[PDB]
Amino acid sequence: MFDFIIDFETMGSGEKAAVIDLAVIAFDPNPEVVETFDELVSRGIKIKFDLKSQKGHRLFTKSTIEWWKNQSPEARKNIAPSDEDVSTIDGIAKFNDYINAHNIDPWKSQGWCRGMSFDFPILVDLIRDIQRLNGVSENELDTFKLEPCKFWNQRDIRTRIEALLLVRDMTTCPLPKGTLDGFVAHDSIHDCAKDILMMKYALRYAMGLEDAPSEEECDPLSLP
Amino acid sequence: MFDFIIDFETMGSGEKAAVIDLAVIAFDPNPEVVETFDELVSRGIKIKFDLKSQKGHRLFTKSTIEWWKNQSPEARKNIAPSDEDVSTIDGIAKFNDYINAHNIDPWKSQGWCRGMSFDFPILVDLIRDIQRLNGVSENELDTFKLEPCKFWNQRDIRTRIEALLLVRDMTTCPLPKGTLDGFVAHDSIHDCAKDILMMKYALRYAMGLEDAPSEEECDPL
C-alpha cells in the first residue's frame, strides 16, 4: 500500500480554478524506507491541461494572472500551450490510470498535499465533471466512491511537518546535503519529490532514527 | 495572541454547501496553558443560518439530505428553523466581529478544522459573497485581506493529532478523566472544545509535559 501526493498549478483560486497542470506521485509511507529524489521524480507524472478550452467552464482570477506575470520565464514555462495538453476530462482519466497503477488503496491510502483546502477541492470538482457530463444535476452529484482517497484520509503537508518538527510555522524540513542534487526550479514533479522527502526525514527525525543536519551539513535547497 | 477553530454543519459538500450553523472558538495555543472544556465552551459562539433564504443560492446535496434523515431526532434538532437565524451575509459579519474581538493576528495566527478541505473552502466562499455584494465580478474576487488567517496558516486537525501521536489514522486523543464532563453529542461548540482539548493534550503528550493515560475520560475513545 502507498500514499500519494498531488500538486496543481492554477490560473484561479476557487474550486472552479482553471488548471495549468497536475503532478501526482505515489510514495511508500514506511518511515524505514527512504526513496531517493531520482526515482520519486521518475515515478511521478505531470498532466498538462489545455487552457483555451476551459474558457467559460473554469475560472481565471485577475489576482492570479497578475501573479504569473511577475514570474521568471523559467516559471512561466509551465503555462505555455503545448501539444501534450489534454482536456480536464482526459486529464482526470490519466490521473485515475496513475492511481490504480500504483498500489493505492481506496480505503486505507492517504492523499498528501501542501495546501489541503486548495488542491483537493479542485481535484473533486474535476472528478464531478465526469458526472455533470453524464447529465447528473448539481444536487445529485456523488463522488464518494470516485475519489483517490476517503475525505478523512486527506492530509496537509504544512500541518504534518510543523507537528513532526514541533516548531510553530515550520513547514519545510532540512535535509542531508546533496539529496537536493538534480533539483530544477519550476518543475511540479520536483516540488512533490521535495515535499515527500521532507515529510519522510521529518518522520524519521521525530522517531529517533536520523540526525538533524547542521546548517553546514544540509542541502541549501531544503532550508526556506 | 490566539488561534481559532471553526466548524460548519451543512446540507451539501461543495464550497456552495448550504450552511446550517457555524461554530468558532478562539483558543490559547501555548502548551503550558491548559483550558477547561467549560471555559472554552462559554468562550465560543455558534452562528445559525436561515436555510430557506439560501435556497437557489447555496447547494442542498441529496446524499447529505439523506444522511440527516438517518440521524437521531436529537441531532436532527439542530436543523430546525429558529428565531436566532441569520442570513449568510449577516452571519459572516458576526463571524468577523468575533475574530476581531479575540486576539487573532491576521498574519501569524492559525485557523483549524476537521477536514481542512471542507470547512475553509466554505468559509472563504462566504467571504467572497461580501465581495460579490460590493459589485465585484468572479474573476476579480479577491479576499486575501478579509480572511481570518492567511491560507498558509491554515491547519488540519486530523493531520495534527495523527502527527503528534505518531500513530497512523489516529485522529482523536485520549484525555485525562473528567475533562469532557459536560460534553453533548450533536453540539458544534462542544465538538470544537473537544478538538481544541485533544490537540493541546496531544501536543503536551508529544512534548512530554504530561504522560498520556490508559485510564481516560471515557469520551476520547
Which residues lie across from B24 on neighbouring strands?
B6, B45
Distance CA A69, CA A64 (A): 9
- Could you give the angle at the alpha carbon of A24 between the alpha carbons of A19 and A25, nearest 5°? 165
List CB contacts (< 8 A) between A56 and chain B.
none
Residues whose CB falls within 8 Å of the CB of residue A179, separated by 6 or more in sequence, listed in order = A36, A37, A197, A219, A222
* The residue type at A162: E
Distance CA A132, CA A49 (A): 19
For A123, nearest residue in chain B (alpha carbons) = B117
Is the Cβ–Cβ distance between B86 and B94 less than 8 Å? Answer: yes
Cell triple for B90: 449577516
3-state secondary structure A192-211: HHHHHHHHHHHHHHHHCCCC
* Interchain pair A155, B151: CB under 8 A: no
Given resolution (angstroms): 2.9
Distance CA B35, CA B95 (A): 22
How many Cβ pairs within 8 Å bridge chains A and B?
Answer: 105
**Which ranges of chain A would DSSP assign to H, the alpha helix?**
37-43, 62-69, 88-101, 119-133, 157-165, 188-207
Beta strand ranges found along A11-54 (DSSP E)? 19-27, 45-48
* Interchain pair A59, B151: CB under 8 A: no
Is the Cβ–Cβ distance between A94 and A84 less than 8 Å? Answer: no
- For B117, the closest of A12, A154, A166 (CB atoms) is A154
Distance CA A158, CA A162 (A): 6
Is the Cβ–Cβ distance between A122 and A19 less than 8 Å? Answer: yes
Q: Is A146 buried (19+), middle (13-18) or exposed (0-12) by CB count in 10 A?
A: middle
* Interchain pair A15, B14: CB under 8 A: yes
* Interchain pair B63, A118: CB under 8 A: no
* Interchain pair A159, B164: CB under 8 A: no
Most A CBs within 10 A among B5, B16, B54, B116, hence the mutation to make, goes to B116
How would CATH label the architecture of A3-207? 2-Layer Sandwich (3.30)
Tell me which residue of B15, B162, B213, B55 sits closest to A16, measured CA to CA: B15
CA dist B15 to A104, A118, A121, B12, B194, Å?
Answer: 27, 11, 8, 8, 25
**Would you call A69 helix, strand, or coil by DSSP?**
helix
Tell me which residue of B109, B113, B99 sits closest to B29, measured CA to CA: B109
Residue B112: CA atoms inside 13 Å, Cβ hemisphere, count? 29
* The residue type at A182: G
What was the elucidation method?
X-ray
Q: Looking at chain A, how many residues does it have?
A: 224
* Interchain pair B154, A156: CB under 8 A: yes
**C-alpha distance from B117 to closest chain A C-alpha (Å):** 4
CA dist A176 to A18, A25, A195, A218, B44, Å?
Answer: 37, 22, 14, 5, 44
**C-alpha distance from B126 to closest chain A C-alpha (Å):** 12
* Interchain pair B166, A141: CB under 8 A: no
Cell triple for A125: 470538482
